[PDB]
Design a binder for this molecule. Structure first.
Ligand SMILES: [Zn+2]
Lengths: 88, 90
């Protein structure tokens, strides 16, 4: 699921020491709507504009906002793969 | 240098001069948009094509801010982007 993929992202970014990213993913994972998800993304984009997790999370939430949930999840699967490859 | 749209016109001209063709067309489309919902629709289609383009990234953020009714902070983002583009140009 989207939230399950978010949880894996959060674990990998945590293992990588991305604490701002961890905070935003966790808050998006616990959001009640796409509006709130996107509000969270915007706040963290302000704090860390170059962060690869934030940038991919932004694009995925955009896709979820459009009802393109499968593509949104494919974005996170690719982010998970990138995080893993930095880690192994 | 004034409204959101004029700032967008200036981004569009500098990005054109630098040769950012995708970002030029996105900014042109955002500028001619009827709603923040349309503006965001355009940003997303162009983020898919070129996710690392600096103009697209700042445009996305400015449109978010406009979406939240923070029009003045959105203009400030574009003003910072215009400053950066003018730096790489001269
Ligand atoms: Zn965005």
């Amino acid at each position: 699921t989207f939230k399950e993929l978010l949880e894996e992202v959060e674990k990998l970014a945590k293992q990588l020491g991305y604490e701002e990213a961890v905070e935003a993913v966790k808050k998006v994972k616990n959001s009640k709507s796409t509006r709130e998800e996107m509000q969270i993304v915007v706040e963290y984009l302000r704090i860390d504009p170059d962060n690869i997790v934030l940038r991919k999370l932004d694009f995925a939430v955009h896709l979820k906002d459009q009802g393109k949930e499968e593509e949104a999840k494919k974005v996170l699967e690719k982010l998970i793969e990138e995080l893993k490859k930095q880690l192994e």
